[PDB]
Amino acid sequence: IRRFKASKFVFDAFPDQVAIQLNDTHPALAIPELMRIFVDIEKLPWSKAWELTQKTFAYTNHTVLPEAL
Amino acid sequence: ENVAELKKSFNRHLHFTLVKDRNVATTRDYYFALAHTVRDHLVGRWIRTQQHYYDKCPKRVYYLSLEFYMGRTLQNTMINLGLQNACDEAIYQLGLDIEELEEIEEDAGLGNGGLGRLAACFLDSMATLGLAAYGYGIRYEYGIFNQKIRDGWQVEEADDWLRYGNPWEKSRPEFMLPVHFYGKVEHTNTGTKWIDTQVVLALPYDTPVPGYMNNTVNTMRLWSARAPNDYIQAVLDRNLAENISRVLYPNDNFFEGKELRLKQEYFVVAATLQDIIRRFKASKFVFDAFPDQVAIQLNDTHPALAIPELMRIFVDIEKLPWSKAWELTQKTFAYTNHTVLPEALERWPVDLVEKLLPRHLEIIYEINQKHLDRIVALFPKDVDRLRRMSLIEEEGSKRINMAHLCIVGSHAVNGVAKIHSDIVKTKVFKDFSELEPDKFQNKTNGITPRRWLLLCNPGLAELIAEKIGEDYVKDLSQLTKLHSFLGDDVFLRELAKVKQENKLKFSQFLETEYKVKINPSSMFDVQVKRIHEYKRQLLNCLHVITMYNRIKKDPKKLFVPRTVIIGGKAAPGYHMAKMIIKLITSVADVVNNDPMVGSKLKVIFLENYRVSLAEKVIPATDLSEQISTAGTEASGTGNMKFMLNGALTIGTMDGANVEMAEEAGEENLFIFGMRIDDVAALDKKGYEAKEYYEALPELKLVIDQIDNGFFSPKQPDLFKDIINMLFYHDRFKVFADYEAYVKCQDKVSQLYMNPKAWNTMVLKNIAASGKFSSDRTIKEYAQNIWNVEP
Amino acid sequence: AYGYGIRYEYGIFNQKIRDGWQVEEADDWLRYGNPWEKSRPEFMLPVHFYGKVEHTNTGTKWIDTQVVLALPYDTPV
Amino acid sequence: ENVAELKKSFNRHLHFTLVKDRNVATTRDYYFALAHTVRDHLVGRWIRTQQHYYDKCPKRVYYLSLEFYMGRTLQNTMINLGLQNACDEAIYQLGLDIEELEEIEEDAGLGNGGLGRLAACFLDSMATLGLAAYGYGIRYEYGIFNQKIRDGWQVEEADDWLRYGNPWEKSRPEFMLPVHFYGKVEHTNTGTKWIDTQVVLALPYDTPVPGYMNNTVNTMRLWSARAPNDYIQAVLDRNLAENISRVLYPNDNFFEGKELRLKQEYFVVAATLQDIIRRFKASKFVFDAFPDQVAIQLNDTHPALAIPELMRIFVDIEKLPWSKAWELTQKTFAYTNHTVLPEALERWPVDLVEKLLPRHLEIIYEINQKHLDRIVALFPKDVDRLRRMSLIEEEGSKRINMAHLCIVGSHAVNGVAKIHSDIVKTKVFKDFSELEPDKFQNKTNGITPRRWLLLCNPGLAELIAEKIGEDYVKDLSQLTKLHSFLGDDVFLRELAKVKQENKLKFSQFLETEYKVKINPSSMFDVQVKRIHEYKRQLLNCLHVITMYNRIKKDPKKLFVPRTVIIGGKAAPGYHMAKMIIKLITSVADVVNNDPMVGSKLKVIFLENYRVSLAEKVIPATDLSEQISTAGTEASGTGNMKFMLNGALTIGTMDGANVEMAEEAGEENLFIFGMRIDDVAALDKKGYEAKEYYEALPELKLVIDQIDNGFFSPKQPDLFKDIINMLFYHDRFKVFADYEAYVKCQDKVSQLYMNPKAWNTMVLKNIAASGKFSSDRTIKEYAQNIWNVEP
Ligand SMILES: O=C(N[C@@H](Cc1ccccc1)C(=O)N1CC(C(=O)O)C1)c1cc2cc(Cl)ccc2[nH]1
Ligand SMILES: Cc1cc2nc3c(=O)[nH]c(=O)nc-3n(C[C@H](O)[C@H](O)[C@H](O)CO)c2cc1C
Numbered sequence A: 001i002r003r004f005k006a007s008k009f010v011f012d013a014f015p016d017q018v019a020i021q022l023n024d025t026h027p028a029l030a031i032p033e034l035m036r037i038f039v040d041i042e043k044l045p046w047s048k049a050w051e052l053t054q055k056t057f058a059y060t061n062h063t064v065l066p067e068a069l
Numbered sequence B, D: 001e002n003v004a005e006l007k008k009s010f011n012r013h014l015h016f017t018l019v020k021d022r023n024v025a026t027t028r029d030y031y032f033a034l035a036h037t038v039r040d041h042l043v044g045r046w047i048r049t050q051q052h053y054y055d056k057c058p059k060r061v062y063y064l065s066l067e068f069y070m071g072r073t074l075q076n077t078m079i080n081l082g083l084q085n086a087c088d089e090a091i092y093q094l095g096l097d098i099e100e101l102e103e104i105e106e107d108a109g110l111g112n113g114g115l116g117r118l119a120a121c122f123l124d125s126m127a128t129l130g131l132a133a134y135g136y137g138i139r140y141e142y143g144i145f146n147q148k149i150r151d152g153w154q155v156e157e158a159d160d161w162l163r164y165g166n167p168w169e170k171s172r173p174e175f176m177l178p179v180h181f182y183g184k185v186e187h188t189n190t191g192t193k194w195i196d197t198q199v200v201l202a203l204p205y206d207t208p209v210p211g212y213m214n215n216t217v218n219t220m221r222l223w224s225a226r227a228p229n230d231y232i233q234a235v236l237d238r239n240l241a242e243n244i245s246r247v248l249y250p251n252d253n254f255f256e257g258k259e260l261r262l263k264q265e266y267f268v269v270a271a272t273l274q275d276i277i278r279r280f281k282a283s284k285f286v287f288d289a290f291p292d293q294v295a296i297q298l299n300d301t302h303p304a305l306a307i308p309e310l311m312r313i314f315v316d317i318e319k320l321p322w323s324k325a326w327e328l329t330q331k332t333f334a335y336t337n338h339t340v341l342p343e344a345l346e347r348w349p350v351d352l353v354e355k356l357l358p359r360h361l362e363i364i365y366e367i368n369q370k371h372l373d374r375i376v377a378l379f380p381k382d383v384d385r386l387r388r389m390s391l392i393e394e395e396g397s398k399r400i401n402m403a404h405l406c407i408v409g410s411h412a413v414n415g416v417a418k419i420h421s422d423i424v425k426t427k428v429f430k431d432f433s434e435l436e437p438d439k440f441q442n443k444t445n446g447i448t449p450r451r452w453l454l455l456c457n458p459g460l461a462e463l464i465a466e467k468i469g470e471d472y473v474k475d476l477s478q479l480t481k482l483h484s485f486l487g488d489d490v491f492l493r494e495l496a497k498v499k500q501e502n503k504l505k506f507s508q509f510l511e512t513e514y515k516v517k518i519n520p521s522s523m524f525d526v527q528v529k530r531i532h533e534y535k536r537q538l539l540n541c542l543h544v545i546t547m548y549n550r551i552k553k554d555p556k557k558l559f560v561p562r563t564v565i566i567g568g569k570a571a572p573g574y575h576m577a578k579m580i581i582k583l584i585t586s587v588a589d590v591v592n593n594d595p596m597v598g599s600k601l602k603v604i605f606l607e608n609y610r611v612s613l614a615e616k617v618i619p620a621t622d623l624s625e626q627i628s629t630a631g632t633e634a635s636g637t638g639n640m641k642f643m644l645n646g647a648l649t650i651g652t653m654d655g656a657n658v659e660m661a662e663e664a665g666e667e668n669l670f671i672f673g674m675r676i677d678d679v680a681a682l683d684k685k686g687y688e689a690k691e692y693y694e695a696l697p698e699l700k701l702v703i704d705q706i707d708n709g710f711f712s713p714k715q716p717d718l719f720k721d722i723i724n725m726l727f728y729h730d731r732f733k734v735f736a737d738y739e740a741y742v743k744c745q746d747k748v749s750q751l752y753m754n755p756k757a758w759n760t761m762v763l764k765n766i767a768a769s770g771k772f773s774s775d776r777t778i779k780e781y782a783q784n785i786w787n788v789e790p
Numbered sequence C: 001a002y003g004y005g006i007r008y009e010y011g012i013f014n015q016k017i018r019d020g021w022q023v024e025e026a027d028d029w030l031r032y033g034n035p036w037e038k039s040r041p042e043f044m045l046p047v048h049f050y051g052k053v054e055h056t057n058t059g060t061k062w063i064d065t066q067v068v069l070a071l072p073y074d075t076p077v
């Protein structure tokens, strides 16, 4: 976020500048954290923040084994 | 109130309220549609807030002022209500630009400067603190004139701000009241009667004042004059009564004893007091507890008439005995002193008051007798003391010293800054403070962090919130947490980037608005405030010329580039202020079009300086000029806005400037020139400007260029009047601080060449601005004068 | 592109075979120093944990949290 | 190594080492770039110096201490290497400020006070004298805590000095060693075996110690604890072993028998001795000549375990017979005693030692038996003598008297000042000194002229060099040449100007760091050292209050203005020290904000007193407070720093203070209060503080104000604990020296009114400071204890 705000590119073009790949679910918390930042800190309305969030993240699934879930 | 419903409401208003569709709607229609959409969100809380005050009956505060410099309302309301981001999105989705719509709104310029803006800032803080407070003024049809520059000179254009309609005001027809004028006093056996008077009705218009994120919505009530009830001429003559609220007197720190002004003062006072009395009698609360329920702050002496009006009501109407009425009166009123400059002092000729307000003149006389009787009793031999403490001045023509009336009719009197309150208490009113030492106080001025940080500088507010949370909005003292980042280079560069973007945004403004090309990386040197000899933009002008010559001298010399901006309105009758403006536009013309200086130095006279425009330039400023002669600026508030927004200050030890150094460390401000004591010593010893012009080679050159036509070739002696005043009548000693000033300025540029140290000092300023919130100012007023609580 | 992870003081354990069985030994890979990483002190950040949620009129606040700093170390790719 | 190549190296490091360019580099990057640039200049000589010791094999000296209070290293290194002026120029040319870069460096605060600073000063002198000496300690991850003042109280913040990296330390992985703990003793037929122990590795980190202008670079080796080699928990539990070198115990003159502290002591001792033995066996030198090649100085009893550890190694590992090993041991070790205060004495419970170091407990017992057997043989009838001379104390719980172990295992024992060494020899250890009179010695402490004159006060060093040459740097006794200028008015005014500039520079410090405005021409009254009841900043606080009342009494009285500064850290558990700090910040708050005193008297509590901060305030000081109760301060070294830097001393006849009067003439110091004998007489006779409070009217007032809340209105009994101790438990007799103290203080101000006489006395102090160089101290240690030569 800090690097975005210093890019000279207020987050409308965030996902046109940022792509975040979730390697397995381990960093899944990144989704509600981005929202937390967008909403609680940056004051964006939920709907707009949620949209940017989805455009930002992509998730990679690495297993169907039950004990890894 | 999310995005989808907001777009829905907007379309609804555009259709039903503006009678338009997207193909025929104008930009003004879009602005109004949004304003109405936002306004609706205020209704519920406004009704509940006023209803709350009725039910729980907390002690109420009434800020009575002839001025309320409110600026624009849309953005402010969206922010205090937490709707800005949703609206911004709604408008964007609809394919519009919210910035463009916002520019459509007229400033509510019902004030001249600091005095009226302080009232505006106070209403915002009182609502954010949740106090049961009301603002009472006049709804001027025309506010402070719009300023134009013609052939380098200021021209005045009527500020017809209501032409297209004000969606933020609400006519309250059921509370109209009659105000009385002229007539004659009749002393009967049933009491004294004020008869054969002419009546002018007062219709109040309520404007909501939303507190910052707290569901509180207070009221600002402004009164408009209306006539009561050859035929044609008789109807046209109705304009005469309505002229009372027609236009704001455009003078800053200047008393103009016009009969119409007297009418305005009584008008607002009479309507206001009647309205307060009526509300008191309906409170479900005997005027015994009146002052336990009512506090009325006199903003300067302008509404001084409120004292004998309250007495008139208590005695003539309510039949209370004089002694009891007088006691309740003093417990009700508190007076705020805003200046020690002689030309601002209100002294109304007893003759004029006798004709217009005969009953009030009798009441003021009675107050004066009871007053002098007390003094004669304690200090018999001291005759001259009675002369000095009287509400009446018999110098040439007899007149009323309004300030003295305010002191005796109030239980508390305050100055607006330590240095000023001290002078008011111990020097100016020594005779009074000696008798009642506990009466005089100080209440250092403040500015609201909402309009002056959150609204005007979203970039800065965000950066700060990112690092220390949002609690600082409601408690600005929180800014001291910014200290932890003093050695944080990334933060300092982030701070510098916010200021950089403000400058770029404002540069776009200056290039489309004005010819000139701006160096976005130059240092923005700014002085924006009302044009005054005492505020000295003239001294500033002497420095600009100095920098000019220097470049012409050594062209290739390493010079930190500057974009110098000076803006402000001069009162219409102030000839010297108008001459100084012309002098500045002349200089700029030469500097901006000289090929040897080019992008090195650019000068701009920012026209039509006003609240909405202050919100633009202030956040873009690097260097804030606060250079009034020591002892002249009672306080200042522009100095605070610049400090809160990341600009370094170059100024004298005057008004609140002194406290800014106290809070931030004198070393972190560019203080210079004479101090209160130094100006005194020079006065006793005698000032002769001619000597500095003699000693200072850079100054002599500046002066010779001005007086010889270098800056007015077609009118070689155009500035003759400026030259004479500076040499033989400069009460503000421009030449005396010129050397220290230029030296101070040189150091500023030296520090500017060091981005890391400049920004480190800025940080120390911002982190130290917490004291200057009007929330803190209001808290002190509330617990030490009004005796009220949230 | 950038890779973002955790600089573990200890990576996957070093495996030993004792009496035919695997035994785990701490992988203290930083003991002698890593010339390939570059501390970036200017970009340290605070991370929050625990605390409690507070719903106010200025927005929701996450308060009374414990803070742990995060110092990033850059490795070139 | 001229300016051009230095700028080149700096840019090279900024690029390759910090991976930056001028647009993205931080201030910390610039500091590191310079540090690396300077560090490179140490490599050649460091390798050659250590290589020289190997080839020519001179007898080596090992200063084993749990503390090394090193301060910052950049400036020191630049100076001892003669690179400061070139670097200063290089950095300036690059557009940077070397002072700012220098401030970035963290102090290496691996010490508490005098004891750890003495070790640091000794390393500098040993290198300047060219001795083959090494410093051996613990590389604490956290040094002495950073002190903060919150609501007037001290707060402790972790001193994470390694967070950003230490460029001055060099990991020496090839010399890692295992240290053993716990386990059990096994007596076999092949010798005794210490088995089933837990192991903690010790990795040594070398720091160079550059001698002053002599190509010698010695080593300071600090050990860091590392673990050897449920899974997750097992890895986390590795923190337990590494906790041994995690943090310095922050107590000054206070024994805290915590098991972790015991581990630290054995840790550093075991690693150190193994390393020394290994180096001995590789020297190309049979342990017969071990002590002719090795000398190990025990800095206080902290590393006392080194004696039975050496024996353990000699006997259990090297298989030497007890008698031979014991002889070599005594010839190897020498012990330095640093205090006679009871709470500083190390007495470890045999129980704790039994579990942690079972084999060492057996060795200590054996030593004690052989010891007592000797005493029983010479003094049969004297039973109690055996009780008094035993290494074991059976008072309540059995514990080891570490001091007694140090005496019997060493061939020399020394005090740190004449008066202290006398007390140690004839009073405290009379039983031992009687048997071996030649064993006890004195070695008066010293300070290094480099860090404490050349570095910290460039202005003074230059003035002196201008008049008497630079030879004084390496032979401070040279300062007596300054006598020739005793009647030289121009020199005396030059001396006064240097002190004046130090004050101004430091005033800038105090005003930006603290609120208060300082009178740069006031007398700087300073007391900076660790907060202790025995050092009495409390007595000082009684005087400040006295001066306060006096001004309040007679406002217009001619009073020499003072800026009183008291600074120091209190150990975390020391409640009275913490109360005294609060008492001082409270008093300051009242004094500094009282309008009647104003610029007359200002009080400052200099927070986070540390080595780098001592270098600032000391050179700016006019009056140095050395007021401990006679007999309490073993020596002191702060007293010497102030004397060398042009301050006059007000103090008691204690520690080294006595020798300062001897050297400079008692008349040229403000000595006062009880002397060693006077405190004794009072003890026998019994002390009753209540009587002085009775007799002294100025004192009674001070006390009543403290105890009544005059300095704590919101907490009227806040200082109740201070009042009780002073009246019923003041082991340091504050009230007893109060009168003589205040009288002495009055005379100081009288002399201050006479600039010519004040400065004449200062000159006599500086010209007489030569004895207090640590170069002289080390020379005496070298020829009378270590038997070594350059
Ligand atoms: O630490 C130095 N060099 C470094 C060199 C280095 C840097 C990065 C990875 C491996 C090696 C060093 O030896 N180490 C860093 C590792 C650690 O932190 O454990 C080990 C160093 C060089 C030097 C030269 C002088 Cl004159 C004085 C002190 C010095 N330290
Ligand atoms: C602080 C100040 C404010 C003034 N304001 C006005 C004004 O508002 N209108 C006007 O005609 N003159 C104004 N004057 C000018 C004043 O009436 C008088 O003409 C000059 O000071 C005499 O030199 C002002 C002067 C001062 C010092």
Ligand SMILES: Cc1cc2nc3c(=O)[nH]c(=O)nc-3n(C[C@H](O)[C@H](O)[C@H](O)CO)c2cc1C
Pocket (backbone or CB within 6 Å): D250, D251, D252, D253, D254, D341, D343, D532, D533, D534, D571, D572, D573, D574, D575
């Ligand atoms: C010279 C000296 C040093 C002391 N150091 C400490 C200390 O470091 N920590 C602590 O908790 N108490 C310390 N004390 C206080 C001591 O343990 C004891 O509490 C008091 O002296 C009893 O009044 C010290 C006392 C003295 C006289």
Ligand SMILES: *Cc1c(COP(=O)(O)O)cnc(C)c1O
Pocket (backbone or CB within 6 Å): B112, B113, B114, B117, B528, B529, B530, B609, B610, B611, B614, B635, B636, B637, B638, B639
């Ligand atoms: C704040 C403000 C002022 C007062 O500024 P000073 O510099 O204190 O005189 C005047 N006019 C406007 C439009 C303001 O915003």
Ligand SMILES: *Cc1c(COP(=O)(O)O)cnc(C)c1O
Pocket (backbone or CB within 6 Å): D112, D113, D114, D117, D528, D529, D530, D609, D610, D611, D614, D635, D636, D637, D638, D639
């Ligand atoms: C020298 C020094 C000391 C010892 O000072 P005394 O006044 O002798 O107790 C303690 N702390 C620091 C930081 C020092 O420089």
Ligand SMILES: CC(=O)N[C@@H]1O[C@H](CO)[C@@H](O)[C@H](O)[C@H]1O
Pocket (backbone or CB within 6 Å): B114, B115, B118, B252, B253, B254, B300, B338, B339, B344, B416, B445, B633, B634, B635, B636, B637, B655
């Ligand atoms: C009479 C008058 O307008 N006085 C003005 O009042 C404002 C508000 O207090 C001050 O900040 C300012 O210095 C002063 O010039």
Ligand SMILES: CC(=O)N[C@@H]1O[C@H](CO)[C@@H](O)[C@H](O)[C@H]1O
Pocket (backbone or CB within 6 Å): D114, D115, D118, D252, D253, D254, D300, D338, D339, D344, D416, D445, D633, D634, D635, D636, D637, D655
């Ligand atoms: C146990 C201890 O820390 N003793 C301290 O040692 C130093 C160094 O010798 C002395 O100057 C000082 O007076 C004394 O208090």
